[PDB]
Amino acid sequence: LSGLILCPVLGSIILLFIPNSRIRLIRLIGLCASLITFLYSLVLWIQFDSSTAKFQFVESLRWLPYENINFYLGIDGISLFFVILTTFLIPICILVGWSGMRSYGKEYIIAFLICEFLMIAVFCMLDLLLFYVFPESVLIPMFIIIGVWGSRQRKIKAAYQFFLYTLLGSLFMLLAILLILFQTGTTDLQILLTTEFSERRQIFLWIAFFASFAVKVPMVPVHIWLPEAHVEAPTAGSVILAGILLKFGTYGFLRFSIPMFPEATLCFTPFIYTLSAIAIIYTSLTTLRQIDLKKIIAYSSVAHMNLVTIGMFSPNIQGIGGSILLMLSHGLVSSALFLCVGVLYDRHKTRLVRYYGGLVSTMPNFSTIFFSFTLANMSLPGTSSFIGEFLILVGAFQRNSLVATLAALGMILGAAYSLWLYNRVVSGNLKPDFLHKFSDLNGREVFIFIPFLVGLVWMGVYPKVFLDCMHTSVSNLVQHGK
Amino acid sequence: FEESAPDGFDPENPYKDPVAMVEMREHIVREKWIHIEKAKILREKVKWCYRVEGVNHYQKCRHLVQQYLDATRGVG
């Protein structure tokens, strides 16, 4: 990993010295740098050994001498394919932008502000202080991606009181991170694993992490930032948001909640149970109220992510496997649906949803692919999302199956409204006022669709290569939770 | 795929030896998977019993299948 780690930063910076009004070169070379960092992510996958509690390719550089809070970079188990999904998806955003001129949307600026692999950092960052810096850090890139080239639906903004609470929750986690950091000098995640805290304080520290996380996670009391953040997000800002920025909260719980505070997690199991359950119920019923397509997909994403939560709780190896594989399948499916709804916007240039009609005439291949992914967002058994969600379900393994009975409503209403909305979008010869402008999909368009469908099917028919490469790590996490 | 059953030196109180405490985790989970795969091998052997009989295909192994199941306890 030593050299092949910093591909996106090197690429971005050495392209910053190429303003190059003639876009062809910046597009080509940024895309090549992204694709080669993805290639090195994938060869790093191939490099994996599914047999160690240690982290696969550890590296560091002194960051502050005393207590050495340094860039500790591990990729065991989950992070392995989290960074893989990150890379998998970043060329997708670079490729959804072969727009010809791309002038006001200055192409090199979006290249340089999507080609920041701080997501790679955080998923490999294995000392929760610097790990803290990155999800909060990616907000500066996310904010510029969300509105600079993002569609303007309102005076671009986020609920100000909610945003203040969201960042306050993030900084509340920071106080908890410091309390553990000075609690026993424990710099990094290996030693924060080894150490043992006061049960009276483990619960406080757990909920303090949980503040920021359950903001990043879309739980019922605070999740509103996803719809408002997406309906304004650009086509490639949503692909990243759904893809990774939601995985942030669940991976945070996975690494720095379950094997960190085993007693606090034991104590708060019913809390997250009910939270995620009622969140899934709400976000299943809501798309009744929401007619906005981006809000629809964002709420389906909330549902899936709170399923990821209702599964990560468990010492069930199947439980957390279903959690992380619902994460992978979600970063595939919701991002593929955001790709879909972005194509559906642009090809129609309209931001009402009642206006997407006669799709089987305009773009019938888009109808086929939109089904190929909406069956997934409802988790058709056979798809990747099915393996994910059902290992989430069997996560009631040592349990007594009372939260699966709330996932009942959460997923039945989800699949129901998934089908309702796929109909509502493709229904009828509802002639729109587009002046016979059909907008058939592009070869590059079906290309950027290719990898999501491929990952989806390759998981849904063969989840081994992902459950393997993971079981050793998750099982170590579980025994530390034992 | 070459590990050792001894976990070095870990007493019951595990705060003392973080090296040995991590090693007990990493190889007692190896033992966890030992007996999990033992249950899985005995399950493939339950399928093997069924394959063999084909006419009883419940009996002549069912109490031995209960022995198989005794790899798991506390069913309540």
Binding site: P270, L402 | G76
Partner: peptide, 23 residues
């Protein structure tokens, strides 16, 4: 009704607790 689900959710939590008391 919303507060009803909020309290019945922790009631299902308590049902898990009663199952824990079953053994």
């Amino acid at each position: 009704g919303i507060f009803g689900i909020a309290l019945p959710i922790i009631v299902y939590k308590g049902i898990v607790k009663d199952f824990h008391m079953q053994d």
